[PDB]
Amino acid sequence: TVVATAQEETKQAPGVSIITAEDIAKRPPSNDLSQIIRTMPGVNLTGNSSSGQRGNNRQIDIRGMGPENTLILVDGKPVSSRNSVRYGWRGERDSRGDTNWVPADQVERIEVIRGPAAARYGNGAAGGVVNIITKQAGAETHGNLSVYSNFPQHKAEGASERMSFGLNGPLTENLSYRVYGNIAKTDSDDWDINAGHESNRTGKQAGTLPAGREGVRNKDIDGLLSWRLTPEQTLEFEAGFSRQGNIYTGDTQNTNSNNYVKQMLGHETNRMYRETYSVTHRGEWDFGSSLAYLQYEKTRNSRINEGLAGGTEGIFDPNNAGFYTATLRDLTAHGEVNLPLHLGYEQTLTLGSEWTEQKLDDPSSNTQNTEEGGSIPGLAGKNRSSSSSARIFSLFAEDNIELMPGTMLTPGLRWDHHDIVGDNWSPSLNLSHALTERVTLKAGIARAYKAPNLYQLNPDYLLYSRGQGCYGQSTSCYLRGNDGLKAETSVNKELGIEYSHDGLVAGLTYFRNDYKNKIESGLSPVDHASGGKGDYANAAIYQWENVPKAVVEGLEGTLTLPLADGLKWSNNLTYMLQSKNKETGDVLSVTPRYTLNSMLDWQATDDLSLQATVTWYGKQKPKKYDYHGDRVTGSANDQLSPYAIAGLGGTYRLSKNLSLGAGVDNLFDKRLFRAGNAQGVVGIDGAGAATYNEPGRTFYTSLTASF
């Protein structure tokens, strides 16, 4: 009886969680799937950057590794769209992330793959992988129509509404389709949600506010045709078109303001179009199995002009009104075969390759001139190229070996060639061992890989500061892209033991990542520019640089008890032991010290299902040091205290064809307000860890019609 693939076997590793379509129906998200993905152990909902900048745009972070290290897939194929949004000095991006491209109600399941089992997915999988799997066609035609709406207690918070539909099944005998569409709106929080809560602001900056959450408008449609060519051979064509337009509520990099900002409150100021085309060929043959695919993803990011420095740094530029478009083109090709091998040991060999190209055209990002800080040899002050690109060819070999009943060994090797950075080697080993019929011991260790992003790699990408931003000094500097960077790598390990029997589950996992060569803004000048104006002349030139060592470490626990026949109590716990940049001694990603998610699920009748949830978060602590590397003082030290969020909801099945849902999130109305960024600037104190809004009590209803 044949052994599963490497890819399939390692989905049982300690660092993997699965969220089902039924889980999504019972705990419906407002809009972005991050709202449910974040409730898995070892997962956090975090700002992109430890600076706090754009800190209400929280995203899925795995094991404290930061959202940039979460690789998002849809049906196994990569999402790159956030790479069209400029990556700044502090790793900030004015991006909502990549977990909102698929509507929740057309999702079959979600694989959350954390740590060593994720390394095999290659570039970007150092934190882990989130693979969003869409519902597919079956034998008969089926379909659905799903609506969701919510209702905040406090009018300052944005309400969401959402309507989607699927239809799939045969068209002819050889030919079947699957299509879905979706329309959604999450309103923005109000411009003044955080008035009463903001960091102290003086002088010019009196009256300024940190913004609440940005709104979004989604239109998605997808079409897939599946064509059964030979008995061995299916060919699938799929095109997807998504648009997200924002609803602006005053976010700016440093939380300053001007009239162009005040004028755009409530309007669309950024729009993302994502176009996807894929062809997928599946074979079922005598020898085993094959899969190949080609995806082209085109992302257009159009938004209002902002400055890179000066008075218009990270804010709409009133002297260059209007919008620009950055374009990202990402082509991914993949092939593999899966070979059951019967001699010696039972095992299943996977052999494959992948090629990717990323092209970025960004006409706002490479425009910093050198007139103030002085000129930089090899860098033209003006008219630098918009474009950047990189290609990675990959080879891999994996084998899933049943050493003997109850024991599996799963070695793999990936090799990657990046046409600028060079070669990478990602060795992989995961295993499971049955200690008794009820208890299993599992371990993993691997080296994940992440290539530099195209901003960090580009010598034409140049940022400038008069002093505030410069590490180890107070005079003016430049930060320049560096096309000799190393790749980041992370040796990620876990050890897990788990009791499992009769739907009772008790489990504990320890994890640690030794994160190598994380790419960050440099700490020492490599050089000095020459000329410029006044005190600012002859600016220091820093580069994007590899940090030698960082570490995350902690524990994930799970406890699921069957209290009675229709009644199940599920809990998971994550405890962060470390998240440290070992060069700066500072925090890598600001996450709660612990997160405990608890759910009581009651099948009250055949037709009626009720749920209660509570989540407890521990303390959050900000960066110790400012951009200079000096000890932060004052309110920039502020920490968030522990807090809990509770909810209640249910589903009532009116028939095979109609179900309704209702409930309340954050039942005791526990709210937090964004006070600012972590550290301050001239006129505006920092706010430490108080960098985000936690919404209050919010009621919701849903209806799903299906056949």
Radius of gyration of the chain (CA): 25
Q: Say if CB 201 and CB 683 are below 8 A apart.
A: yes
Q: How far apart are CA 706 and CA 144, in angstroms?
A: 4
Give the residue among 464, 532, 631, 453 at the shortest CA–CA distance from 83. 453
Under 8 Å CB-to-CB from 19, ≥6 apart: which residues? 36, 37, 40, 109, 110, 112
Q: Judge whether 661 and 607 are in contact, CB under 8 Å.
A: no
Count Cα neighbours of 416 within 13 Å in the Cβ-side half-sphere. Answer: 29
Distant-in-sequence, close-in-space partners of 36: CB < 8 Å, separation ≥ 6: 19, 23, 24, 27, 29, 104, 110
Give me 299's structure tokens: 């992302």
* Half-sphere CA count of 435, side-chain side, radius 13 A: 9
What method was applied to determine this entry? X-ray
Q: How far is CA 252 from CA 45, 52, 271, 380, in A?
A: 21, 11, 16, 29
Q: Please enumerate in sequence order all residues whose Cβ is within 8 A of that of 401, keeping only pairs 6 or more positions apart, or say none.
A: 3, 345, 346, 347, 408, 409, 410, 411
Pairing of strands 643-655, 270-284: unpaired
Cα–Cα distance, 280 to 196 (Å, whole number): 54
Taking CB atoms within 8 Å and a gap of at least 24, the contacts of 562-565 are 562/502, 562/503, 562/504
At 10, phi and psi to the nearest 5? -70, -5
Exposed, middle or buried: residue 682 (CB in 10 Å: 0-12, 13-18, 19+)? exposed
- Name the one residue in this structure whose structure tokens are 């992440």: 450
Nearest CA to 590 among 639, 545, 543, 636?
A: 639
Q: What is the dihedral of CA 693, 696, 699, 702, to 10 degrees?
A: 20
What is the helix (H) or strand (E) element at residue 567, kind and residue range? Answer: strand 567-581
d(CA 283, CA 287): 11
Cβ count within 10 A of residue 587: 22
What is the residue-wise DSSP string for 253-281? SSS---HHHHHHTTS--EEEEEEEEEEEE
SS3 label, residue 694: strand
Helix (H, G, I), strand (E, B) or coil at 536: helix
Among residues 515, 579, 583, which one has the least CA distance to residue 552? Answer: 579
Q: Residue 625: which residues within 8 A CB-CB, separation 6 or more?
A: 584, 585, 586, 631, 632
The architecture that CATH gives domain 6-706 is: Beta Barrel (2.40)
Question: Cα(387)–Cα(460) distance, rounded to whole angstroms?
Answer: 9
Q: Nearest CA to 356 among 328, 388, 336, 333?
A: 333
Dig out the tokens for 700 from the structure: 């919701």
- Residue 119, classed as helix, strand or coil, is helix
For residue 230, CA distances in Å to 237, 288, 340 come to 16, 15, 22
Give the Cα-Cα-Cα angle 100, 27, 698 (nearest 5 degrees). Answer: 85
Q: Which two tokens stand for residue 645?
A: 């969020």
Q: For the chain, how far is it from start to end, CA to CA, in angstroms?
A: 35
Question: Under a CB-based contact definition with an 8 Å cutoff, are residues 456 and 544 in contact?
Answer: yes
| CB-based contact 430:448 (threshold 8 Å) | no
CB of 147 closer than 8 Å to CB of 658: no
Token look-up 């129509």 returns 145
Which candidate, 280, 278, 279, 282, places its Cα nearest to that of 234?
Answer: 282
DSSP string, 210-239: ---PPEEEEEEEEEEEEEE-STTEEEEEEE
Cα 624 off chain centre by:
25
Q: DSSP string spanning 45-58?
A: EE-S-TT-TTTTS-
Cβ burial, residue 172 (10 Å; 0-12/13-18/19+): exposed
Amino acid at 481: G
